[PDB]
Structure formats: structure tokens, C-alpha cells
Amino acid sequence: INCTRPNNNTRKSIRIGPGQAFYATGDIIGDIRQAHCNVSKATWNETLGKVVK
Amino acid sequence: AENLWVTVYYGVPVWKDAETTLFCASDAKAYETEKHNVWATHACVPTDPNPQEIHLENVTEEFNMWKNNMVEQMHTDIISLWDQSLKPCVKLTPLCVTLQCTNVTNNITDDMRGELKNCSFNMTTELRDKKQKVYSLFYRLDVVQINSNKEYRLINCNTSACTQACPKVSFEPIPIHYCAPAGFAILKCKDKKFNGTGPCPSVSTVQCTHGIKPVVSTQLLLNGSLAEEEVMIRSENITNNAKNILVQFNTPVQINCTRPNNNTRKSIRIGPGQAFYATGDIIGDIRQAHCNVSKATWNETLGKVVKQLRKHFGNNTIIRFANSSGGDLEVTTHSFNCGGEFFYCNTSGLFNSTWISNNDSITLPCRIKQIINMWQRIGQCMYAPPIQGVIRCVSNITGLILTRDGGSTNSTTETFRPGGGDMRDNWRSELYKYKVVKIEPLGVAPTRCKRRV
Amino acid sequence: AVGIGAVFLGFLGAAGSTMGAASMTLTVQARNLLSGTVWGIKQLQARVLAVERYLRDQQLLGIWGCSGKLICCTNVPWNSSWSNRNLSEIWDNMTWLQWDKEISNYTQIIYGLLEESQNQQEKNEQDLLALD
Amino acid sequence: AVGIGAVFLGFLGAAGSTMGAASMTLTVQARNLLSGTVWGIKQLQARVLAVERYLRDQQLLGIWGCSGKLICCTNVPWNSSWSNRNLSEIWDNMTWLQWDKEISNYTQIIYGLLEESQNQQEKNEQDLLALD
Amino acid sequence: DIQLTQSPSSLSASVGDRVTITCRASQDINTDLSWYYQKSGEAPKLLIYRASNLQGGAPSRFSGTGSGTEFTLTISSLQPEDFITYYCQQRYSFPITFGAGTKVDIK
Numbered sequence: 001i002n003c004t005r006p007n008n009n010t011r012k013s014i015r016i017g018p019g020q021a022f023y024a025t026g027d028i029i030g031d032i033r034q035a036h037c038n039v040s041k042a043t044w045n046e047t048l049g050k051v052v053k
Numbered sequence: 054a055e056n057l058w059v060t061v062y063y064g065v066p067v068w069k070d071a072e073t074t075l076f077c078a079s080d081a082k083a084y085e086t087e088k089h090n091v092w093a094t095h096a097c098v099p100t101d102p103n104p105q106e107i108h109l110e111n112v113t114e115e116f117n118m119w120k121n122n123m124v125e126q127m128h129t130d131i132i133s134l135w136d137q138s139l140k141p142c143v144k145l146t147p148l149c150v151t152l153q154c155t156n157v158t159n160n161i162t163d164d165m166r167g168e169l170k171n172c173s174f175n176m177t178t179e180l181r182d183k184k185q186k187v188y189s190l191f192y193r194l195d196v197v198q199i200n201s202n203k204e205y206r207l208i209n210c211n212t213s214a215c216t217q218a219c220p221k222v223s224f225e226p227i228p229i230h231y232c233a234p235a236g237f238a239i240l241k242c243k244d245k246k247f248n249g250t251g252p253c254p255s256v257s258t259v260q261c262t263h264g265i266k267p268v269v270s271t272q273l274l275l276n277g278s279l280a281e282e283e284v285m286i287r288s289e290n291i292t293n294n295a296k297n298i299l300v301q302f303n304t305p306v307q308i309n310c311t312r313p314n315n316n317t318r319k320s321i322r323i324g325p326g327q328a329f330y331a332t333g334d335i336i337g338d339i340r341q342a343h344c345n346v347s348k349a350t351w352n353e354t355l356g357k358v359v360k361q362l363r364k365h366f367g368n369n370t371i372i373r374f375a376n377s378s379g380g381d382l383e384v385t386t387h388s389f390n391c392g393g394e395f396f397y398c399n400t401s402g403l404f405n406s407t408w409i410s411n412n413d414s415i416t417l418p419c420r421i422k423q424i425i426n427m428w429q430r431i432g433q434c435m436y437a438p439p440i441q442g443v444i445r446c447v448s449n450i451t452g453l454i455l456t457r458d459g460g461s462t463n464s465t466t467e468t469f470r471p472g473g474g475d476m477r478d479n480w481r482s483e484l485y486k487y488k489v490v491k492i493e494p495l496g497v498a499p500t501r502c503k504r505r506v
Numbered sequence: 507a508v509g510i511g512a513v514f515l516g517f518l519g520a521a522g523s524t525m526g527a528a529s530m531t532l533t534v535q536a537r538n539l540l541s542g543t544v545w546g547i548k549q550l551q552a553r554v555l556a557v558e559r560y561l562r563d564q565q566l567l568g569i570w571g572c573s574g575k576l577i578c579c580t581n582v583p584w585n586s587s588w589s590n591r592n593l594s595e596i597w598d599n600m601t602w603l604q605w606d607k608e609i610s611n612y613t614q615i616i617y618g619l620l621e622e623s624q625n626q627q628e629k630n631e632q633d634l635l636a637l638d
Numbered sequence: 639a640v641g642i643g644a645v646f647l648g649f650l651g652a653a654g655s656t657m658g659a660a661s662m663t664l665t666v667q668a669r670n671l672l673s674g675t676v677w678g679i680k681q682l683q684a685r686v687l688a689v690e691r692y693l694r695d696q697q698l699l700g701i702w703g704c705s706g707k708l709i710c711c712t713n714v715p716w717n718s719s720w721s722n723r724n725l726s727e728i729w730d731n732m733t734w735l736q737w738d739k740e741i742s743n744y745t746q747i748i749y750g751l752l753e754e755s756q757n758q759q760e761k762n763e764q765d766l767l768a769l770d
Numbered sequence: 771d772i773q774l775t776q777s778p779s780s781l782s783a784s785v786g787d788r789v790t791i792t793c794r795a796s797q798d799i800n801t802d803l804s805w806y807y808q809k810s811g812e813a814p815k816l817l818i819y820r821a822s823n824l825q826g827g828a829p830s831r832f833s834g835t836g837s838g839t840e841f842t843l844t845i846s847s848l849q850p851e852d853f854i855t856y857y858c859q860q861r862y863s864f865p866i867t868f869g870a871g872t873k874v875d876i877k
């Protein structure tokens with residue numbers, strides 16, 4: 001099984017108090033698409049068949 | 054007779070070497086009151102008198118103090134004990150705040166121009182609705198500027214916030230003893246000219262080492278042991294220029310440090326059961342704390358050290374002493390503790406001389422600090438409450454740490470500068486005549502006798 | 507009184523003599539084995555270690571069928587393959603450490619033979635007693 | 639050399655043979671009983687419990703006057719009530735585990751007989767050696 | 771290969787006679803060697819192990835000695851059962867080799 005997130009991310013830091021850091025997401029550079037997973041078909045079909053038998 | 058059968062023995066005297074955990078032992082005299090001190094807690098078993106020493110003969114053993122155990126062990130123990138003692142004390146979080154500060158013109162001598170700052174600020178009271186205005190004094194080496202108007206901030210504010218020291222605690226060291234459990238032995242080499250590594254024919258065994266006094270210092274050693282024949286020099290590889298050199302003296306030298314200034318004290322309330330201590334007011338003229346040593350004593354001691362050192366780099370050579378090269382404020386100057394305070398003394402006036410082949414007193418100044426981060430850690434500072442009345446103590450100088458500077462070709466001349474910085478060497482200067490071994494009672498040998506049915 | 511002192515016999519200090527004289531003085535060592543918040547935890551570890559060490563030796567001596575004595579004989583025959591020399595030099599001029607480093611390699615087999623020898627002895631004796 | 643491996647005689651794997659063979663390999667098993675900030679306490683407790691168990695059964699063996707030996711006979715006769723059987727089958731076919739399961743009911747009864755037999759025997763012989 | 775020579779090739783002597791047999795190696799093999807005995811019709815067995823250790827169960831009249839490229843077997847008193855064949859075998863690096871074989875005869 002292959003699963004991926006293609007979007008790009010940045011990072012940032014902010015100070016709260018004495019020696020206290022906090023990370024917040026920055027900005028995005030390009031378009032955005034949904035992360036997703038892929039699997040095969042024939043392998044799945046045959047495995048389900050064997051399990052049924 | 055010729056044919057023979059095996060035989061078994063028990064309790065044979067043979068041993069090997071290994072490592073194991075040691076434990077402590079303290080004199081019962083310390084147990085008499087004195088319940089407030091960082092070290093010397095009551096958990097140590099009371100010691101015993103009349104220690105006994107057993108002599109050995111015909112033995113020869115090899116020693117190597119450089120690759121020695123039971124140094125890091127006591128280092129870790131000291132750090133852990135310090136951290137444990139420091140735990141239950143009030144925090145100092147709310148003080149990080151802007152301040153209004155000005156000079157202090159109260160008959161100060163010219164050398165102290167701008168070394169004291171009078172500051173005022175706002176601070177919450179016990180009831181969270183109200184606030185109050187307060188003031189205090191500070192030294193130049195604890196405050197920083199940011200950006201007409203004048204403002205200042207603390208130096209550690211952006212790094213971390215740390216705990217104020219509790220009022221009633223004692224930093225005075227006392228003798229301590231180390232002892233090993235049953236099934237192990239401690240060996241000592243009593244040769245009076247053994248140079249720290251190699252064979253030793255004269256050996257003995259003991260159960261508990263002699264007294265040890267933990268002390269923290271840099272660029273010098275205080276209240277150490279005294280040699281018996283002459284000044285000795287030790288090192289791992291003297292030819293290499295990247296390794297320090299330890300010099301142990303034969304006779305002691307005396308030194309007097311003093312802070313003639315006078316102080317008072319004041320208390321402020323921060324919250325529920327939260328007290329804070331701040332400097333009060335000064336009473337009269339102010340002078341720099343300083344330290345003194347003799348002259349002729351130092352001269353002759355340096356002469357003897359040079360004469361002894363000459364036996365390695367040929368007699369046709371020149372020697373020149375130079376001050377510290379430079380760097381951060383913690384290695385470049387000799388720092389020490391006396392009576393719950395911390396001084397920083399500039400030693401430029403002691404290693405300024407040269408030597409070729411074939412009632413006056415030296416006085417030096419020092420400075421004061423109030424925020425400390427020792428053991429070269431980060432994120433852990435302290436606060437030292439002020440003390441009332443003058444202070445003065447006296448001690449002994451017994452050893453030096455030197456580092457040889459690089460050279461070029463054979464310039465018939467060499468230079469040395471003070472070094473140090475790592476506290477391991479300070480412990481290593483003492484425990485270089487002790488080894489730990491383990492017993493192996495079993496044994497086997499052939500014998501003419503045969504077992505009977 | 508004025509010249510009379512004290513001369514005791516101490517802990518392990520006879521390890522500078524021949525292979526033979528040292529064996530005359532062994533008992534003393536045998537009588538010195540079970541002698542009896544972070545700043546006090548390690549004592550428990552030390553005590554546990556000591557008792558375990560003593561018990562291991564007790565068991566090992568027990569198995570070989572020589573318990574309760576300091577000098578015990580056996581039946582396994584010595585073999586010159588392991589070592590050389592004769593009784594005279596061995597018991598006249600040598601030290602225990604020298605012997606230890608000499609026989610270091612061949613130890614496990616020498617240990618191993620003893621228990622099977624003892625087992626054969628016991629098994630034969632059992633039938634010898636049970637036949638009547 | 640070349641062409642020879644290595645054979646040992648290890649752990650409980652000999653626990654499927656008949657009655658006779660297993661008793662050959664007793665010793666090895668007997669040797670494997672004393673092998674050697676919140677995680678330390680539990681393992682320390684486990685070690686302490688193991689040591690306590692070893693001491694307990696050692697003492698129990700000691701009471702029956704058979705210390706230092708792996709085999710020991712005694713005077714208590716064997717009542718046929720518990721299990722009649724006969725020598726051939728028990729010493730030929732029966733295995734250890736099934737035998738233990740089959741005689742799991744009459745242990746406490748047996749122990750007291752050995753205890754009292756030893757006590758009476760020792761008391762009797764004390765007088766005989768006393769009149770000597 | 772490591773050639774092994776057995777001497778004598780054959781021998782004839784009466785019973786009870788004290789006799790010797792020798793096995794010589796082509797090159798030095800230290801003492802990784804053994805001696806086996808056999809009669810026709812029976813499987814071979816090892817009489818002597820390592821040329822220095824007496825195998826369990828063998829009569830003591832047999833004795834083995836030597837090293838390097840020379841090894842010797844001595845029978846103090848011959849017996850009727852001792853009229854058999856012998857082979858010196860090398861337990862060294864590959865391959866594996868066996869001796870020519872020596873026979874004992876009654877005269």
C-alpha cells in the first residue's frame with residue numbers, strides 16, 4: 001500500500017515567555033491537493049476470494 | 054609417586070581488577086549539630102577510629118591514573134547532590150520586567166565610575182488587584198540595555214528563569230571518606246618518587262581513604278596536599294602540546310582576600326508566603342575588594358619550579374611566562390568562593406617574567422558577580438542573597454595547571470599559559486594513589502595424594 | 507610495657523612467598539567474606555551483590571562433594587598435556603598469580619570432569635549399599 | 639581439527655525419557671537456580687524472592703539430615719495405601735510429570751514422618767555416644 | 771597429497787612377542803592423528819586417539835607415541851586377537867587420507 005501527502009509546508013517559531021518557543025505553520029507556496037492512498041486491484045480480488053473459500 | 058591426582062584448595066590469595074560502586078563515610082563530629090549544609094548529610098555511616106594498614110613485600114604492580122575509574126563517579130555524585138539540595142526553594146519568575154535605572158554618586162572613587170546602578174520598578178503584591186513601586190541596587194555585570202529615555206533588563210531573562218537560593222544553608226566543605234564493600238580491596242603505592250604511571254614495588258592495602266575536601270576553583274588549587282621531596286610535574290604526554298600539565302608544590306604559600314565594603318539587607322513580599330531579599334543602603338565610602346600575597350616567597354617558588362622543569366627541554370633554553378590568552382570571563386580569570394560569595398580576580402600580575410640560561414606585597418583587584426551558571430551547564434542559574442558586614446578569609450596555594458603554547462622549529466625558547474576549565478582535573482589531582490581490586494578465592498593444583506574411598 | 511608491642515596476622519599479605527608456604531595460612535581469609543535519598547540507595551545493591559557472590563561459591567563447592575573442609579582430594583588423574591614441570595620446583599619456587607596465569611586456558615574441562623566423576627562414585631556406591 | 643562439531647548436555651530437554659535415564663542428568667539442572675527510578679525496585683524484589691526460595695528449600699533439605707548429597711535413603715516404610723503398583727512398571731514406563739501428578743495428594747503426610755524419624759534417631763544415638 | 775607410509779608392510783611372529791609398527795608422514799602435521807584396527811568382515815574402529823590418549827576399553831598392552839612426521843605403536847605382548855590390520859588416519863585439513871595398511875601373521 002502506498003500513501004502520500006503531496007502538499008508543501010513551511011515552519012515558524014514564536015516566543016511566549018522565558019525560553020519558551022512555539023511552532024506555528026507558515027504559508028503555502030502553490031496549489032493544494034488532497035493526500036491519499038493507493039492499492040492494487042487484482043491482488044485484493046484474489047486475496048478476498050481465498051479468504052472466502 | 055610420579056602419577057598424581059588433582060586437588061582443590063579454598064581461600065587462596067589471588068586477585069584481579071574490576072570496577073564497583075563505592076560508598077561514603079563521615080566523621081561523627083560533623084553529626085554533632087550543623088544540620089544545615091549542602092553536603093555532609095546524615096546518611097553517611099559514622100566512621101571508625103584507629104585505621105589499620107597492612108604491609109606487603111616482594112610485590113610489583115603497574116599504575117595508570119590517566120585511564121582511571123572512580124573519578125567520573127564522584128563527579129556525578131557531586132552534581133546529583135547539588136541538584137537535590139537546591140530543589141525546595143522559592144521561584145523567581147515574576148521579576149522579568151522593564152526597569153528605570155540611574156548612576157550612584159556618593160563619593161565613589163574614580164575607578165568605580167559606573168559600577169553601581171540604582172534601579173526601580175513595579176511589582177505585584179499579595180492581593181492580585183494592587184501593585185507597588187520598589188527599588189534596589191545592582192552591579193554592571195548583571196544588567197543589559199535595550200533600544201533620551203533610559204531602560205534596562207536582566208541578562209538571563211530571554212534564556213531561562215531560575216531559583217533563588219534558600220536563606221539558611223552552608224557551603225563550607227568538610228572532610229569526607231570513601232570506603233568499599235566486602236569482597237574488594239583498595240591498594241595504595243607508597244613510593245615517594247613515583248611519577249604517576251608505571252611500576253611500583255612498595256604497596257599496601259587499606260579500607261578507607263584519607264580525608265577529602267571538595268573545592269571548586271580554576272587556574273589554581275587551594276587547600277590541597279603537600280609533596281615531601283620537591284616540586285613535581287605530571288602529564289600524559291609532555292611532548293604533545295595539546296595536554297595540560299599539573300604542577301604540585303613542596304611547601305605552601307599564603308594569600309589574603311578581603312572586601313572592605315559594608316552592606317545591609319531588606320525583605321519584600323511577592324505573594325502568599327513568598328519573600329524576596331534585596332540590597333539595602335551603603336553606609337560610607339566604598340572600595341574595591343582585593344587580594345594580597347607576598348613577594349619573596351613567590352619569587353623563590355617560581356625559581357625552584359623553573360629549575361626542576363629545566364630537566365626536559367635542555368639547559369640551553371629560554372622560558373617566558375604570559376597571562377591568559379583571552380576568551381570568556383570564566384576561564385580567563387581565577388574564580389573562587391569564600392564565605393558564600395563569588396569573586397573574579399585578574400591574575401595579570403603573576404605570570405609576567407622571563408628566565409634565561411645560566412616586606413613588599415603583590416596586590417591584585419577582583420570583581421563581584423551575583424548570577425552564576427557553574428559546571429558549564431545551560432538553563433540553570435542561581436541568585437546569591439547579600440550578606441551583612443565585611444568578609445575576610447585566608448587559604449593556601451598548593452598547585453598549578455599550565456599549558457604549553459605552540460612553537461616553530463627550535464627557537465631555544467618556550468612559553469606557558471594558565472589553562473584549566475574542566476573540573477575533572479581537580480579531582481584527578483588527589484586520587485592518583487589508589488586502585489581497586491577483587492578477590493578470587495578458588496584454586497586448583499596437582500598433588501601426589503589420592504583420595505580414599 | 508616499654509618495649510613490648512603488638513604483632514598480629516592480617517589480611518592478604520602472604521602473596522609474596524612460594525607456592526607452598528602460602529597454603530599454611532589460608533583460614534584467615536575464609537573468615538572475611540560475610541562481614542557486616544540517592545545518597546544511600548547503593549548500599550542495598552552492594553549487600554545484594556555480596557550475598558549473591560558468597561552463595562554462588564557455596565553452591566559450587568557443594569556440588570563437587572568436598573563441602574565442609576578446606577583441603578579435599580579427588581580421583582581425577584592429572585595429565586601432562588595441560589602442563590609440565592615437577593613437584594619440586596612447583597612447590598619450592600612459584601607464586602599463586604604465576605600459576606593462575608599459567609593454567610588460565612584449561613579450566614572449564616578441569617571443572618567439568620569432577621562432577622561426572624562424583625556422579626559415577628555415587629551411583630556405584632548406591633548399588634553397593636543396596637545389594638544387601 | 640576439521641570435521642568434528644560440538645555436543646553438550648543442556649537444559650530440561652531430557653524430561654521425556656523413562657524413570658532411569660533422567661536421574662543421570664540431575665546435576666546440571668541443580669546448577670541452574672542461581673543464575674546472574676522504578677524499574678530497579680521490581681527486579682531487586684525478584685532477585686530477593688529467588689534468593690529466599692533457594693534458602694528455604696536448602697533449609698528444608700537440611701532438616702532431613704541429608705545435606706551435601708544428591709541421594710539419601712531413610713527408614714520410613716512405604717505404605718501400600720498410597721499406590722500399590724510394582725517396581726518394574728514404575729521404574730520402566732512411568733515418567734516424572736505423571737508420577738508427580740499421581741502422588742500430589744500425600745506430601746504433607748510424608749514430610750512429618752521423615753522429620754520425626756530423624757529426631758527420634760538422633761535422640762536415641764545421643765545416649766549411646768554419651769555412655770561411651 | 772599428504773603421503774603416509776606404514777612399516778613393516780607385513781610381519782610374521784609367534785604369540786606373545788613384543789612388536790612395533792611405525793607410521794611416517796610426508797610433512798609435519800603436529801599430532802592430529804589416530805590409529806584404527808580392523809579384521810576382514812568387521813567394521814573398523816579407532817584403537818588410539820591423538821597418538822597420546824588411550825581409548826576407553828582398549829587393553830593396556832598397546833601404547834602409542836610420537837609426533838610430527840613419525841608415530842609408533844608398540845605391543846608389549848602379542849595375542850591371538852592382535853593378528854589384525856591397522857591404519858593410521860590423519861584428521862587434518864582436507865582431503866582425508868588413510869594409510870597403506872600393515873598385517874600381522876602367525877609363524
Ligand SMILES: *[C@@H]1O[C@H](CO)[C@@H](O[C@@H]2O[C@H](CO)[C@@H](O[C@@H]3O[C@H](CO[C@H]4O[C@H](CO)[C@@H](O)[C@H](O)[C@@H]4O)[C@@H](O)[C@H](O[C@H]4O[C@H](CO)[C@@H](O)[C@H](O)[C@@H]4O[C@H]4O[C@H](CO)[C@@H](O)[C@H](O)[C@@H]4O)[C@@H]3O)[C@H](O)[C@H]2NC(C)=O)[C@H](O)[C@H]1NC(C)=O
Binds near residue numbers: 268389446448449
Ligand atoms: C582553605 O582552608 C582555610 C584554612 O582553614 C580556610 O580558611 C578558613 O575558613 C573557615 C571556614 O570559613 C573560616 O572559619 C570562618 O571564619 C569566619 C569567622 O569565624 C571565626 O571567628 C569568629 C569570631 O571570632 C568565631 O566565632 C568563629 O567560631 C570562627 O572562629 C567566618 O567566615 C565563619 O564564622 C561564622 O561564624 C561566626 C561565629 O561568630 C560568625 O561571626 C561569622 O559571621 C560566620 O557565620 C556564622 O553565623 C552565621 C549567622 O550569623 C551563619 O549563617 C553561618 O553559617 C555561620 O554559622 C567561619 O568560622 C576560618 O576562619 C578560615 N581561616 C582563616 C585563617 O582565614 C579557607 O576557607 C579554605 N578555602 C576555601 C576556599 O574555603
Ligand SMILES: *[C@@H]1O[C@H](CO)[C@@H](O[C@@H]2O[C@H](CO)[C@@H](O[C@@H]3O[C@H](CO[C@H]4O[C@H](CO)[C@@H](O)[C@H](O)[C@@H]4O)[C@@H](O)[C@H](O[C@H]4O[C@H](CO)[C@@H](O)[C@H](O)[C@@H]4O)[C@@H]3O)[C@H](O)[C@H]2NC(C)=O)[C@H](O)[C@H]1NC(C)=O
Binds near residue numbers: 171172173187188334
Ligand atoms: C536610589 O533610588 C531610590 C529610588 O527609590 C532613592 O530612594 C528615594 O530617595 C529619596 C531621596 O533621598 C528619598 O527621600 C528621602 O525620604 C526620607 C523621608 O522623606 C520623605 O518624607 C518627607 C516628608 O514628607 C518628604 O519631603 C520626602 O520627599 C520623602 O517623601 C528621608 O530619608 C529623606 O527626607 C529628608 O529630606 C526631606 C526633604 O526632601 C525632608 O522633608 C526630611 O525631613 C528629611 O530631611 C529623603 O527625602 C526617598 O524616600 C527614597 N525612596 C525610597 C522608596 O526609599 C534613593 O535615594 C537612591 N539613592 C541611593 C539609595 O543612594
Ligand SMILES: *[C@@H]1O[C@H](CO)[C@@H](O[C@@H]2O[C@H](CO)[C@@H](O[C@@H]3O[C@H](CO)[C@@H](O)[C@H](O[C@H]4O[C@H](CO)[C@@H](O)[C@H](O)[C@@H]4O)[C@@H]3O)[C@H](O)[C@H]2NC(C)=O)[C@H](O)[C@H]1NC(C)=O
Binds near residue numbers: 002
Ligand atoms: C495513486 O493513484 C492516483 C490516482 O490514480 C495517481 O494520481 C495520478 O498521478 C498521475 C501522475 O501525476 C497523474 O497524471 C497527470 O495527470 C494530468 C492529466 O494528464 C497531468 O498533470 C499530467 O499529464 C501531462 O500534464 C503535465 C502538464 O504540466 C505534464 O508535465 C505531464 O508530464 C503530462 O504530460 C499527468 O498525466 C494522474 O492524473 C493522477 N490521477 C489518476 C487518476 O491517475 C497517483 O499517481 C498514484 N500514486 C500515488 C503515489 O499517489
Ligand SMILES: *[C@@H]1O[C@H](CO)[C@@H](O[C@@H]2O[C@H](CO)[C@@H](O[C@@H]3O[C@H](CO)[C@@H](O)[C@H](O[C@H]4O[C@H](CO)[C@@H](O)[C@H](O)[C@@H]4O)[C@@H]3O)[C@H](O)[C@H]2NC(C)=O)[C@H](O)[C@H]1NC(C)=O
Binds near residue numbers: 276
Ligand atoms: C596552610 O599552611 C599553613 C602553613 O604551613 C598551615 O599551618 C600548618 O598546619 C599544619 C597542619 O595543620 C601544622 O602541622 C601539624 O598540624 C597539626 C596541628 O594540631 C598536627 O598534625 C601537628 O601538631 C602536633 O603538635 C601539636 C602541638 O600543639 C599538637 O597539638 C598536635 O597533636 C601534634 O602533635 C602539626 O602542627 C603546622 O604546624 C602549621 N603551621 C603553622 C601554624 O605555622 C595551615 O594549616 C595550612 N592550611 C590548612 C587548611 O591546612
Ligand SMILES: *[C@@H]1O[C@H](CO)[C@@H](O[C@@H]2O[C@H](CO)[C@@H](O[C@@H]3O[C@H](CO)[C@@H](O)[C@H](O)[C@@H]3O)[C@H](O)[C@H]2NC(C)=O)[C@H](O)[C@H]1NC(C)=O
Binds near residue numbers: 040
Ligand atoms: C508503490 O510504490 C512502489 C515503490 O516505488 C512502486 O513499485 C514500483 O513499481 C514500478 C511499476 O511496476 C516499477 O517499475 C518497473 O520496474 C521494472 C524494472 O525494475 C519493470 O517492470 C519496468 O520497466 C518498470 O521500471 C518500479 O521498479 C517499482 N519500484 C520499486 C522501488 O520497486 C509501486 O508501483 C507503487 N504501487 C502503486 C500501486 O502505485
Ligand SMILES: *[C@@H]1O[C@H](CO)[C@@H](O[C@@H]2O[C@H](CO)[C@@H](O[C@@H]3O[C@H](CO)[C@@H](O)[C@H](O)[C@@H]3O)[C@H](O)[C@H]2NC(C)=O)[C@H](O)[C@H]1NC(C)=O
Binds near residue numbers: 153
Ligand atoms: C508602574 O506603573 C505605573 C502605571 O502604569 C507607571 O506610571 C505610568 O507610566 C506611564 C508610562 O510612562 C505614563 O504614561 C503617560 O505619562 C505621561 C504623563 O505626563 C503622559 O504621556 C500620559 O498621561 C500617560 O499617562 C503614566 O503617566 C504613568 N502613570 C502614573 C499614574 O504615574 C509607572 O511608570 C510604573 N513604574 C515603573 C517603575 O515601572
Ligand SMILES: *[C@@H]1O[C@H](CO)[C@@H](O[C@@H]2O[C@H](CO)[C@@H](O[C@@H]3O[C@H](CO)[C@@H](O)[C@H](O)[C@@H]3O)[C@H](O)[C@H]2NC(C)=O)[C@H](O)[C@H]1NC(C)=O
Binds near residue numbers: 290292293294
Ligand atoms: C606525544 O607527543 C609527541 C609529539 O610531541 C608524539 O610524537 C609523534 O607522534 C606522531 C603522531 O602519532 C607520530 O606520527 C608521524 O610521524 C612522522 C614523523 O614526525 C610524520 O609522518 C608526522 O609528522 C607524524 O608526527 C610521530 O612519529 C611522533 N614523533 C615525532 C617526533 O613527531 C607522540 O606520538 C605522542 N604520544 C605518544 C603516546 O607517543
Ligand SMILES: *[C@@H]1O[C@H](CO)[C@@H](O[C@@H]2O[C@H](CO)[C@@H](O[C@@H]3O[C@H](CO)[C@@H](O)[C@H](O)[C@@H]3O)[C@H](O)[C@H]2NC(C)=O)[C@H](O)[C@H]1NC(C)=O
Binds near residue numbers: 344
Ligand atoms: C593588601 O596590601 C595593601 C597594600 O599595602 C593594603 O592596603 C594598605 O593597608 C594598610 C593597613 O590597613 C593601610 O594603612 C591604613 O591607612 C590609613 C591611614 O593612612 C588608615 O586606614 C589606617 O590607620 C592604616 O594606617 C594602607 O593605607 C593601605 N594602602 C596601602 C597603599 O598600603 C591592604 O590592607 C592589604 N590587604 C590585606 C587584606 O591585608
Ligand SMILES: *[C@@H]1O[C@H](CO)[C@@H](O[C@@H]2O[C@H](CO)[C@@H](O[C@@H]3O[C@H](CO)[C@@H](O)[C@H](O)[C@@H]3O)[C@H](O)[C@H]2NC(C)=O)[C@H](O)[C@H]1NC(C)=O
Binds near residue numbers: 307346347
Ligand atoms: C595575611 O594576614 C595575616 C594575618 O594578619 C598576616 O600575618 C600576620 O602578620 C602580622 C604582622 O606581621 C603578624 O603580627 C605580628 O608579627 C610578628 C611576627 O611576624 C610578631 O611581632 C607578632 O607575633 C605579631 O603577631 C601576625 O603574627 C601574622 N599572623 C600569623 C603569623 O598568623 C599576613 O602577613 C597576611 N599576608 C600577607 C601576605 O601579608
Ligand SMILES: *[C@@H]1O[C@H](CO)[C@@H](O[C@@H]2O[C@H](CO)[C@@H](O[C@@H]3O[C@H](CO)[C@@H](O)[C@H](O)[C@@H]3O)[C@H](O)[C@H]2NC(C)=O)[C@H](O)[C@H]1NC(C)=O
Binds near residue numbers: 399400401402
Ligand atoms: C588585568 O590587570 C592588568 C594590570 O596591568 C591590566 O593590564 C593593563 O591594562 C591596561 C588597559 O586596561 C593596559 O594599557 C594601559 O591602559 C590605558 C589604555 O590602554 C592607557 O592609559 C595606557 O596606554 C596603557 O597601555 C596596561 O598597559 C596593562 N598593564 C600592563 C602592565 O601592561 C589588564 O587589562 C587587566 N585585565 C582585564 C581583563 O581587565
Ligand SMILES: *[C@@H]1O[C@H](CO)[C@@H](O[C@@H]2O[C@H](CO)[C@@H](O[C@@H]3O[C@H](CO)[C@@H](O)[C@H](O)[C@@H]3O)[C@H](O)[C@H]2NC(C)=O)[C@H](O)[C@H]1NC(C)=O
Binds near residue numbers: 402
Ligand atoms: C610586567 O613586567 C614588565 C617588565 O618588568 C613591566 O613593565 C614595566 O612596568 C613599569 C611600571 O609601569 C615600567 O616603568 C615605567 O617606565 C617608564 C620610565 O622609565 C615610564 O613609562 C613610567 O614612569 C614607569 O616608570 C617599566 O618601564 C616597564 N618595563 C618594560 C616595559 O620593560 C609590567 O608593568 C609588568 N606588568 C605588571 C602587571 O606588573
Ligand SMILES: *[C@@H]1O[C@H](CO)[C@@H](O[C@@H]2O[C@H](CO)[C@@H](O)[C@H](O)[C@H]2NC(C)=O)[C@H](O)[C@H]1NC(C)=O
Binds near residue numbers: 155156166167
Ligand atoms: C552613568 O552610567 C552610564 C552608563 O550606564 C555612563 O555612561 C557612559 O559613561 C562612560 C564613562 O564615563 C562614557 O565614556 C560613555 O560615553 C557614557 N555613555 C555610554 C553610552 O556608555 C555615565 O557616564 C555614568 N555617569 C552619569 C553621570 O550618568
Ligand SMILES: *[C@@H]1O[C@H](CO)[C@@H](O[C@@H]2O[C@H](CO)[C@@H](O)[C@H](O)[C@H]2NC(C)=O)[C@H](O)[C@H]1NC(C)=O
Binds near residue numbers: 248251289291
Ligand atoms: C613517568 O614515568 C614513566 C616511567 O619512567 C615514563 O614513561 C616511560 O617512558 C619510557 C621512555 O620512553 C618508556 O620506556 C616506558 O615504557 C614508559 N613507562 C610508562 C609507564 O609510560 C613517563 O614518561 C613519565 N611521565 C612524565 C610526565 O615524565
Ligand SMILES: *[C@@H]1O[C@H](CO)[C@@H](O)[C@H](O)[C@H]1NC(C)=O
Binds near residue numbers: 110111522523
Ligand atoms: C622475597 O624474596 C626473597 C628472595 O627470594 C625471599 O627470600 C623472601 O622470603 C621473599 N619474601 C619476603 C621478603 O617477604
Ligand SMILES: *[C@@H]1O[C@H](CO)[C@@H](O)[C@H](O)[C@H]1NC(C)=O
Binds near residue numbers: 159335336338
Ligand atoms: C559623601 O560625602 C558627603 C560629603 O562629605 C558626606 O556628607 C556623605 O555622608 C558621604 N556619604 C557616604 C555614603 O560616604
Ligand SMILES: *[C@@H]1O[C@H](CO)[C@@H](O)[C@H](O)[C@H]1NC(C)=O
Binds near residue numbers: 367369
Ligand atoms: C644540563 O646540565 C646537567 C648537569 O648535570 C647535564 O647532566 C645535562 O646533560 C645538561 N643538559 C643539557 C645541556 O641539555
